[PDB]
Design a protein around this ligand. Sequence first.
Ligand SMILES: C[C@@H]1Cc2c([nH]c3ccccc23)[C@@H](c2c(F)cc(OCCN3CC(CF)C3)cc2F)N1CC(C)(C)F
Ligand SMILES: CC1=C(c2cccc(O)c2)[C@H](c2ccc(I)cc2)Oc2ccc(O)cc21
Lengths: 225, 231
Amino acid sequence: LALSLTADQMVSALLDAEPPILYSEYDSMMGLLTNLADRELVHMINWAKRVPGFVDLTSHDQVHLLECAWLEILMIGLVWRSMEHPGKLLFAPNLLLDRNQGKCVEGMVEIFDMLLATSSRFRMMNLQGEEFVCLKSIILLNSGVYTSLEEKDHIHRVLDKITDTLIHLMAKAGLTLQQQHQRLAQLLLILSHIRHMSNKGMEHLYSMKCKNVVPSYDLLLEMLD
Amino acid sequence: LALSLTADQMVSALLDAEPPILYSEYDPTRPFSEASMMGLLTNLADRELVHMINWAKRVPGFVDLTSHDQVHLLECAWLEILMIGLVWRSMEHPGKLLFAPNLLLDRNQGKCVEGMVEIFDMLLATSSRFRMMNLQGEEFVCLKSIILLNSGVYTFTLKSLEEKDHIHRVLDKITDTLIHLMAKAGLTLQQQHQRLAQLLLILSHIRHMSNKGMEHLYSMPSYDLLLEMLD
Ligand SMILES: C[C@@H]1Cc2c([nH]c3ccccc23)[C@@H](c2c(F)cc(OCCN3CC(CF)C3)cc2F)N1CC(C)(C)F
Ligand SMILES: CC1=C(c2cccc(O)c2)[C@H](c2ccc(I)cc2)Oc2ccc(O)cc21
């Protein structure tokens, strides 16, 4: 049924599944970042269930995709909220942090710097929230797909649908065929830098280890049920 | 002159710039041990690196960048570039990685190195996806150049933005080139968009593999080295 969606219905569904903007619990820096990230994880589960073609997959497959993508998804949301705040990361509306505040934690300013650069690449492209929910979904289905045959064909048909959607959004905003091609690529090439940031960030979270730091296969299996 | 080239001119330059296929050092002791296989793979990798630099300098637009920027693109890209060459070579050996004509290894021969099978599996999976997609050599060389220009660009002043913008325009010329390759093949406009997307999404996984790959190596090239080789 998700394969039957028009471009507009795809965006309407993705825009209507958006998670809400959470606030940072205080009224220690690793503490606020960690607690916030745990709380957005809960909302990300119910976001992912609403991504079209996601619940068409077995729960095993659903959780492998979330396991591979959760940090990328957390990060692309951070970068989106941060577009209109050059030089700062809008973790929460009461947690806007600058490059200098990354230095309070050994290891973080490197990820902080990569997130800022992605945020200004979205600013200098004037990334639209319709395109952004598209990329966020692309990340969900794409980042673990390559690890049975009916499942990865269906995922690749839904990913072909979101490509159609990105092209449609670009045609309706007036861009020529050529500008449509180029913008799609520039948007998708940024996903590979987002992958790099997730990997480096994952890497920091194990040196960071206060133990049981990262969402395990079984924890994620419970939250979707 | 890079930004005036026609699609077919870009395909041409890229195809001639391809580095040769090399051979692994000849009759090592087999069966391998962990130290001897890592020794071969390393020595083969190092020898490919020299040819990669000559390759890099012939990628339209690369030599327009400052020495320092060229090195940084390479420091960030070189393992993805090594790994996509392997996947390409190994497309016609299902279940095998053709590291060299004389070094064709299956999954089980990757267990000889602790931590390596996990990497092996990823590389083989990618090679199977390129098979499933019927990846073309003309597309291959466009994606490789895309890797070289893109991976290091989000890490790069008036001059620094000119550097950034020029690279982004060359990437835009490589996109048009892939699209021309697809249009000329007879694919529809929708099919063109979808295949361009599927290919570019594959570069996200190639980035994952290079990162895990870099992790694996540490668990077991300098700026100065790449810069000397570049001049
Ligand atoms: C700055 C980035 C990204 C980031 C962190 N915060 C966020 C909150 C909202 C949006 C983005 C973020 C933070 C971060 C995080 F993303 C996760 C985390 O730990 C989660 C622990 N939970 C146990 C649950 C399993 F059940 C997972 C701790 C963090 F500081 N940071 C990760 C690093 C640099 C280390 F890559
Ligand atoms: C992908 C890859 C290696 C690889 C890398 C990491 C993990 C792994 O399992 C294999 C390994 C390698 C070994 C040492 C270095 I220095 C670099 C690459 O040997 C290679 C040789 C040639 C080539 O084109 C690719 C590889």
